[PDB]
Design a protein around this ligand. Structure first.
Ligand SMILES: [Ca+2]
Ligand SMILES: [Ca+2]
Ligand SMILES: [Ca+2]
Lengths: 54, 156, 53, 159, 54, 104, 53, 52, 54, 52
C-alpha cells in the first residue's frame, strides 16, 4: 500500500526542516553577542579621552 | 603614529610604526602578518622575525630612547623583516606567542634604509599596509617633510 | 498480479516529479534575466548626470 | 593591483589575490585570467616555469627571479605574452608548490602579467577583467589608470 | 514508491536555490566596482584646484 | 581541420583574425574555442564536462544580415540535446565608445 | 508638474511622467488619473482626440 | 479597477468621528479577502480625506 | 490494485499543501496593516511640532 | 544531556595545534550519527576554549 511510504517520508521531511531551522537559531545567537559588543566598545572609544590643563 | 631617525647629510635611516587593534576585533596573530611598503622605485614585503632570544622585546616598563642601539637591539631588522617591541599589554599576550588583543599597543621597527636600499629623502612619499591573516589592514601613508632639522621626526 | 501494477504507477511518479521540476528550473531562468537587468539599470540611473558650469 | 611604469605606459601588473572567507581550496593551475583595454582582449593561463616561492619570507616584488634549469633570470621580463606567473607572498602551511599552487584560508599570492605589447595602457585608460577559477565566483579587476604618471613614482597603486 | 519522487524534486530544489544565489553574488560584483570608483573620483574632484598668484 | 580550436594555453586577442580563424562562422553556424579543459574532452569529440569553460563564436552581422545597433535587445537560448538551456539576454548600450564591449 | 495661471487660479496643469528604471512598457491608453483639491475628487481618462506627436 | 460605495453613516447608524478605527474584509466566494484597515485622523480639515 | 491508494493519498497531499499555503497568505495580510501603520505614524511624529514665538 | 570526555593528546598521540581541523561522527547502534567538526582557532590565549 502507498500509504506506508508517505508516512515514513513525512517523518524524514520534518526532521530535516528542524535541522535547517536550528542552524539559523544558533547563528542568530552567535551574531547577537558579537554585534552588541562591537557597538558598546566603539561608543566608549569615541566618547572618552584626556586633556592637558597646564 | 609613525616616527623616524635622520642621519646627517644622508636621510631617514629607520622608522617605528605604532599599531593597535580596532574596537571589538578578535585577537590578531601578529607573527603571520606581512607589511607592504611602496616608495620611489621598490615595493617590498617584510615578514615577522624574533627579537633577541624572545618572541617580542619586553619594554612594558619603559625605554630610555627607542632608537639607542645598545638598549633596543635593532640588529635583527634585516632587509626583509621587522621586529616588534611591546609597549602596553596587561594580559601578557604580546609577550608570549605574539598575539595582539584589546587594549594592547605595540611598535613595529623597520630598517628602511636597508629595506629600500637607500635613505628616504625630503619631499618623498611612502605608503603601505600591514595586512593581517584575517581582517582589515592598517594603512600607512606619509610624505617626508621639506626640511629635515632634528634627529627624531614626527612623520605621523 | 500485484507486482505488475506497482511498476506502472512508479513510472507516473517519475514523470510527474520531472514535470514539476521543469517549472521550477524554467521559472528560475525567467527571473534571472529581469533580476540582473533591474540592478544594472537602477545603478546607471543613480550614478549618471550632467552639471552646469 | 600594482603597476610598474616606464616610457609612456604601464608595462607590468601584479594582481594580488586571496580566497573568500569560508572557501574550499582553489587550484590556481587551472584558473584563467581575462583582461581588456577596450582595443584588445587577451586571455592568459599559468606557465609553471615562472614560480617564486621564496618571497613568502619577504623581499621585493617586481624584481623577483625565476629558475630555468642551471640559471636564475628576471621573472617579469621573461614571462610570455599569453601566460601568467605566480609569486607566493603569504602561506603558512606550504600549500603552494610549483607544480600545484593550491591556495587555502589565509594565503595571499600575486598573479604576475606582462602587458607591455599586448595591451596599450597609456593614461586615462579603462581596464576590465576577471580571474576565473575552476569553481566558485570570479574576482573582478576594474580600474582606470591615473591622469598623470610622474617620473619620481614608477610604482603605482591602481586598485 | 513515494521515495523516488522525493529524491528527484530535491535535485531540482537545490539547483534553483543555486541559481537564485548566483544572481546576488554576480550583482554584488557589479556594484562593487561602480561604488568604489564613484567614491574615489568624487574625492579627487573636491580636493583639487588651481590658484592665480599674480 | 580540428574539432575545437585549441587555445588551452592562451590567446593574444580573441578577435584578431589571423590568430583566431573566424572564417568558418558562416551565416548558419558557430564554432567553439576551448579555453580550459584538463581531461582533453573538449579537444577530442567536443564533450563539455565538469570544470570546462568554452567560448562560442557567432558572426552576428552575417547571421542577422545586419550589424546590431545601439539600444537594441537580443535574446536566445543554447539548447542541448538533453537538459536545461543556457539563456542569453542583453541590450546593447546607448553609446558605443570602444572596440570591445562587455555586453555581459 | 507645471501650471499656467490667469485670473485668480491655476487653470491648466501639465504633468510630465516617465517610466521607472527596468519597467516593462506602459500603455497609457488604459491608465487612470485621480486628483483632489479637498473639496472635489475628479477622475479622468484618455480621449484619443487630443494627441500631439 | 472598480470602486465600492458604502453609506457608512447609515450602515453603522452614526457618522465616524476622529481618532477612531474601522477594519474589515471584502470576502469573495472563493479566494483571499481584501483587508481594509484605517484610523480616521485627529483633525478633519477638508471635505474629501485620503484615508488610504 | 495499487492505483486506488495512489489516487486517495494524492487528494490528501493537495489538501495539506493548501492549508500550509493558507497560513502564509493570512499572515501576510496581518503583517501588511501593522507594517504600513507603523511607518505612517512614525513619520508624522518626527515631522511635527510647535515653536514659541514670543 | 550528557558529556563525552576524550583524552585527545593520548588518542592522536600529540596535542592538536592552532589552525588545525578535526572532524568525526558518534555513530549509534541504530539511527543517525552526531557530526563533529571544528577548526582550532589561530591563537590560543586562555585555558578553556569554546570550540563549539
Ligand atoms: Ca594583550
Ligand atoms: Ca596555505
Ligand atoms: Ca573536460
Amino acid at each position: 500500500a502507498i500509504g506506508i511510504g508517505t508516512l515514513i517520508i513525512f517523518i524524514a521531511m520534518v526532521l530535516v526542516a528542524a535541522v535547517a531551522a536550528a542552524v539559523l537559531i544558533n547563528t542568530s545567537g552567535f551574531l547577537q553577542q558579537k554585534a552588541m559588543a562591537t557597538g558598546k566598545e566603539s561608543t566608549e572609544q569615541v566618547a572618552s579621552g584626556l586633556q592637558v590643563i597646564r | 603614529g609613525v616616527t623616524g631617525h635622520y642621519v646627517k647629510n644622508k636621510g631617514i635611516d629607520r622608522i617605528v610604526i605604532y599599531i593597535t587593534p580596532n574596537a571589538g576585533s578578535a585577537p590578531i596573530d601578529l607573527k603571520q602578518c606581512k607589511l607592504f611598503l611602496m616608495y620611489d622605485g621598490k615595493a617590498v614585503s617584510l615578514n615577522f622575525s624574533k627579537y633577541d632570544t624572545n618572541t617580542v622585546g619586553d619594554f612594558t616598563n619603559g625605554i630610555k630612547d627607542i632608537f639607542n642601539t645598545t638598549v633596543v637591539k635593532w640588529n635583527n631588522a634585516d632587509a626583509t623583516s621587522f621586529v616588534v617591541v611591546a609597549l602596553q599589554d596587561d594580559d601578557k599576550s604580546l609577550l608570549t606567542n605574539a598575539v595582539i588583543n584589546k587594549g594592547d599597543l605595540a611598535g613595529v621597527l623597520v630598517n628602511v634604509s636597508a629595506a629600500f636600499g637607500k635613505h628616504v629623502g625630503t619631499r618623498e612619499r611612502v605608503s603601505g599596509y600591514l595586512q593581517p591573516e584575517f581582517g582589515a589592514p592598517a594603512v600607512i601613508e606619509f610624505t617626508t617633510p621639506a626640511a629635515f632639522t632634528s634627529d627624531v621626526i614626527e612623520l605621523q | 498480479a500485484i507486482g505488475i501494477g506497482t511498476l506502472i504507477i512508479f513510472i507516473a511518479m517519475v514523470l510527474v516529479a520531472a514535470v514539476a521540476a521543469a517549472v521550477l528550473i524554467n521559472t528560475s531562468g525567467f527571473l534571472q534575466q529581469k533580476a540582473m537587468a533591474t540592478g544594472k539599470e537602477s545603478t546607471e540611473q543613480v550614478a549618471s548626470g550632467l552639471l552646469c558650469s | 593591483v600594482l603597476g610598474n611604469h616606464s616610457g609612456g605606459k604601464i608595462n607590468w601588473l601584479a594582481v594580488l589575490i586571496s580566497p573568500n572567507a569560508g572557501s574550499a581550496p582553489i587550484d590556481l593551475s587551472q584558473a584563467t585570467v581575462m583582461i581588456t583595454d577596450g582595443t584588445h582582449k587577451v586571455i592568459a593561463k599559468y606557465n609553471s616555469t615562472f614560480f617564486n616561492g621564496t618571497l613568502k619570507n619577504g623581499g621585493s616584488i617586481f624584481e623577483a627571479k625565476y629558475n630555468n634549469t642551471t640559471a636564475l633570470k628576471p621573472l617579469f621580463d621573461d614571462l610570455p605574452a599569453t601566460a601568467f606567473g605566480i609569486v607566493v607572498l603569504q602561506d603558512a602551511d606550504t600549500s603552494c608548490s610549483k607544480d600545484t599552487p593550491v591556495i587555502n584560508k589565509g594565503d595571499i599570492v600575486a598573479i604576475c602579467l606582462n602587458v607591455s605589447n599586448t595591451l596599450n595602457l597609456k593614461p586615462r585608460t579603462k581596464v576590465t577583467g576577471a580571474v576565473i577559477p575552476e569553481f566558485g565566483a570570479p574576482a573582478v579587476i576594474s580600474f582606470t589608470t591615473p591622469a598623470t604618471y610622474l617620473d619620481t613614482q614608477h610604482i603605482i597603486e591602481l586598485q
